[PDB]
Design a protein around this ligand. Structure first.
Ligand SMILES: CCCCCCCCCCCCCCCC(=O)OC[C@H](COP(=O)(O)OC[C@@H](O)CO)OC(=O)CCCCCCCCCCCCCCC
Length: 69
């Protein structure tokens, strides 16, 4: 597809926000959630899943651009 047009600025902002502060705030929430839910049930496996989710977020722009040309 085309990255420009009437909605190019919205797409540019949203794609950058995935690895920017809005994406980092969500990623920080995953770590806080893992720590909090580990108080009663310590489960470091969820921390691994959270990291894999951050890896997906880091690759979100590439994944979207590959499917949607
Ligand atoms: C980044 C660091 C390298 C990653 C290292 C670890 C990766 C985690 C795998 C093992 C964790 C084991 C302990 C888990 C602890 C645990 O209990 O996890 C629970 C969590 C939920 O799993 P289920 O939905 O099977 O289980 C439902 C309940 O178990 C919820 O607790 O498991 C996963 O999400 C991990 C499996 C996904 C692993 C395969 C994902 C690949 C598909 C996605 C690929 C990307 C698609 C992108 C689309 C845009």
């Amino acid at each position: 597809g085309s990255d420009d047009g009437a909605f190019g600025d919205i797409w540019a902002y949203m794609s950058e926000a995935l690895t920017g502060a809005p994406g980092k705030i969500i990623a920080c929430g995953m770590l806080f959630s893992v720590a909090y839910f580990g108080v009663v049930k310590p489960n470091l496996g969820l921390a691994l899943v959270s990291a894999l989710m951050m890896l997906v977020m880091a690759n979100g722009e590439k994944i979207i651009s590959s499917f949607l040309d």
